[PDB]
Write a protein that binds this ligand. Structure first.
Ligand SMILES: */C=C/C1=C(C)C(=O)N/C1=C\C1=NC(=C\c2[nH]c(/C=C3\NC(=O)C(C=C)=C3C)c(C)c2CCC(=O)O)/C(CCC(=O)O)=C1C
Length: 296
């Protein structure tokens, strides 16, 4: 590989959310995505006390600063800006640099109450790895609506194999395509064991830089490992562009503390899935990984 890119030190986000970094000590915004004021209908954010950004959010965050009960990551409802809009704030604390708050607009959900159950039933009947993975791609396509859904399985040589696939009729089948191990570098695999869902809304996005780049607390790039808005590796973006894919969802399948494979979804238009469905996807994949585990 390909093992040298520090993909967690991206210094920028995708433009469909905003990112704030709050000091644990004075609770001011010490770093933010450059779009944050515009996205949040605020005049400014950098250097502003959280009390001014939104007092209720500050009140929400304060208990999470107890080192004996940090209770993160957490997803909180908040209302910010003037005019005021509802957001989901996904908050976590990297080892250094402060408290990160990533904000997505509240919006329409996908409703799963009539369709999740038959898809899960099918998974439960699966008696082989083949059946389980075929049922996985159907379940994730039903739940998420992506144009193509795959189980990308690492073989005994670490090559990537498109082991199961479904797609909307007329699209290309990648079923059975096999790829070099380096297309998913070990460093990326390692991150994906911890950060189990990635959503790339539009491959062609213009990254939104952090301001400042370097954390004022460390003098170093911010650790964005846990950021769902993180900008992705340009080499990977180029890969997807060369295939004509516009958006992706990827969910880790973790077995034995290692990346067994991925549920990989492609869309030919921009696509976002909101917090709750990302959480559901993560859990569904953990349940499937328990089954794989058992199947050998
Ligand atoms: C030598 C390094 C690389 C080459 C060559 C390359 O093509 N990519 C290389 C590095 C990275 N890949 C990263 C992530 C990644 N790559 C894949 C590969 C595929 N996706 C597909 O849909 C298919 C085929 C159908 C292939 C072969 C996947 C699945 C992923 C993970 C994607 C995700 O989680 O969304 C990567 C890190 C990206 C990042 O997270 O920033 C690098 C550096």
């Amino acid at each position: 590989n390909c093992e040298h890119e520090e993909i967690h030190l991206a210094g920028s986000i995708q433009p469909h959310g905003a990112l704030l970094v709050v000091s644990e000590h004075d609770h001011r915004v010490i770093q933010a995505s450059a779009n944050a004021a515009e996205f949040l209908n605020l005049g400014s954010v950098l250097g502003v006390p959280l009390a001014e950004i939104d007092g209720d959010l500050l009140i929400k965050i304060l208990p999470h600063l107890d080192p004996t009960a940090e209770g993160m990551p957490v997803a909180v409802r908040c209302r910010i800006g003037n005019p005021s809009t509802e957001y989901c704030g996904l908050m976590h604390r990297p080892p250094e640099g402060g408290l990160i708050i990533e904000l997505e607009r509240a919006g329409p959900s996908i409703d799963l109450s009539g369709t999740l159950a038959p898809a899960l039933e099918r998974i439960r009947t699966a008696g082989s790895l083949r059946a389980l993975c075929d049922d996985t791609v159907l379940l994730f396509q039903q739940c998420t609506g992506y144009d193509r859904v795959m189980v990308y399985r690492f073989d005994e040589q670490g090559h990537g194999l498109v082991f199961s696939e479904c797609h909307v009729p007329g699209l290309e089948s990648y079923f059975g395509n096999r790829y070099p191990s380096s297309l998913v570098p070990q460093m990326a695999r390692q991150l994906y064991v911890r950060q189990r869902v990635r959503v790339l809304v539009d491959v062609t996005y213009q990254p939104v830089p952090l301001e400042p780049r370097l954390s004022p607390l460390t003098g170093r790039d911010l650790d964005m490992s846990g950021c769902f808005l993180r900008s992705m590796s340009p080499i990977h973006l180029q890969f997807l562009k060369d295939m004509g894919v516009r958006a992706t969802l990827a969910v880790s399948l973790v077995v034995g503390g290692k990346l067994w494979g991925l549920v990989v979804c492609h869309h030919y238009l921009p696509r976002f899935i909101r917090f709750e469905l990302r959480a559901i996807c993560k859990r569904l994949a953990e349940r499937i990984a328990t089954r794989i585990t058992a199947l050998e």
